[PDB]
Amino acid sequence: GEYFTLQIRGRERFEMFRELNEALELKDAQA
Amino acid sequence: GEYFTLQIRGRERFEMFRELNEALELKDAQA
Amino acid sequence: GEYFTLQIRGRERFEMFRELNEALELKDAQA
Amino acid sequence: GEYFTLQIRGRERFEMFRELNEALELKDAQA
């Protein structure tokens, strides 16, 4: 995989993805 | 919290949410 | 496509997906 | 609102958010 950037103009919507990102990233840390 | 239903008409989009759902639910199972 | 159900146990997380669902569904209504 | 960046390490997950981003951004273009 590579490094991708998701620039979102706003604030609330950015938080929404931030949540789906906290869980997904949590799966990689799962152990 | 209560039980909510997200009926999505399609197939690919439903999978997208299915992923964000696999991680979030994984956080509740984390331990 | 068919009809799928996304049952999420909680309330805030359900809203998150609800937003991504309002826009996607908005694309289908776009015209 | 301001400009936020969502750097996700991977490729498929980045696409998932890319979809929820295509619709949300589509709502701002709706008119």
From Swiss-Prot, chains A, B, C, D:
Phenotype when changing residue 10 to V: In sporadic cancers; somatic mutation
Resulting phenotype, residue 6 to H: In sporadic cancers; somatic mutation
Inducers of expression: Up-regulated in response to DNA damage. Isoform 2 is not induced in tumor cells in response to stress.
Transmembrane portions of the chain: none
Annotated phenotype, changing residue 18 to L: In a sporadic cancer; somatic mutation
Effect of residue 18 to P: In sporadic cancers; somatic mutation
Compartments it resides in: Cytoplasm; Nucleus; Nucleus, PML body; Endoplasmic reticulum
Region listing for Interaction with HIPK2, in residue ranges: 1-31
Effect of residue 13 to H: In LFS; germline mutation and in sporadic cancers; somatic mutation; impaired ability to tetramerize and undergo liquid-liquid phase separation
Effect listed in the UniProt record for changing residue 3 to S: In a sporadic cancer; somatic mutation
Effect seen on changing residue 13 to C: In LFS; germline mutation and in sporadic cancers; somatic mutation; impaired ability to tetramerize and undergo liquid-liquid phase separation
Resulting phenotype, residue 2 to G: In a sporadic cancer; somatic mutation
Record note on what altering residue 1 to A does: In a sporadic cancer; somatic mutation
Residue positions of motif Nuclear export signal: 15-26
Superkingdom of origin: Eukaryota
Effect of residue 17 to C: In sporadic cancers; somatic mutation
Mutagenesis or variant effect for residue 19 to G: In sporadic cancers; somatic mutation
UniProt PTM: Deacetylation by SIRT2 impairs its ability to induce transcription activation in a AKT-dependent manner. Lactylation by AARS1 prevents ability to undergo liquid-liquid phase separation (LLPS), thereby inhibiting transcription factor activity.
Result of altering residue 30 to R: In sporadic cancers; somatic mutation
Residues the record lists as Symmetric dimethylarginine modifications: 11, 13
Tissue expression summary: Ubiquitous. Isoforms are expressed in a wide range of normal tissues but in a tissue-dependent manner. Isoform 2 is expressed in most normal tissues but is not detected in brain, lung, prostate, muscle, fetal brain, spinal cord and fetal liver. Isoform 3 is expressed in most normal tissues but is not detected in lung, spleen, testis, fetal brain, spinal cord and fetal liver. Isoform 7 is expressed in most normal tissues but is not detected in prostate, uterus, skeletal muscle and breast. Isoform 8 is detected only in colon, bone marrow, testis, fetal brain and intestine.
Subunit comment: Forms homodimers and homotetramers. Binds DNA as a homotetramer. Interacts with AXIN1. Probably part of a complex consisting of TP53, HIPK2 and AXIN1. Interacts with histone acetyltransferases EP300 and methyltransferases HRMT1L2 and CARM1, and recruits them to promoters. Interacts (via C-terminus) with TAF1; when TAF1 is part of the TFIID complex. Interacts with ING4; this interaction may be indirect. Found in a complex with CABLES1 and TP73. Interacts with HIPK1, HIPK2, and TP53INP1. Interacts with WWOX. May interact with HCV core protein. Interacts with USP7 and SYVN1. (Microbial infection) Interacts with cancer-associated/HPV E6 viral proteins leading to ubiquitination and degradation of TP53 giving a possible model for cell growth regulation. This complex formation requires an additional factor, E6-AP, which stably associates with TP53 in the presence of E6.
Function: Multifunctional transcription factor that induces cell cycle arrest, DNA repair or apoptosis upon binding to its target DNA sequence. Acts as a tumor suppressor in many tumor types; induces growth arrest or apoptosis depending on the physiological circumstances and cell type. Negatively regulates cell division by controlling expression of a set of genes required for this process. One of the activated genes is an inhibitor of cyclin-dependent kinases. Apoptosis induction seems to be mediated either by stimulation of BAX and FAS antigen expression, or by repression of Bcl-2 expression.
Disease in which the protein is involved: TP53 is found in increased amounts in a wide variety of transformed cells. TP53 is frequently mutated or inactivated in about 60% of cancers. TP53 defects are found in Barrett metaplasia a condition in which the normally stratified squamous epithelium of the lower esophagus is replaced by a metaplastic columnar epithelium. The condition develops as a complication in approximately 10% of patients with chronic gastroesophageal reflux disease and predisposes to the development of esophageal adenocarcinoma. Esophageal cancer: A malignancy of the esophagus. The most common types are esophageal squamous cell carcinoma and adenocarcinoma. Cancer of the esophagus remains a devastating disease because it is usually not detected until it has progressed to an advanced incurable stage.
Protein name, per record: Cellular tumor antigen p53
Lineage, opening ranks: Eukaryota, Metazoa, Chordata, Craniata, Vertebrata
Gene behind the chain: TP53
Residues included from the entire protein: 325 to 355 of 393
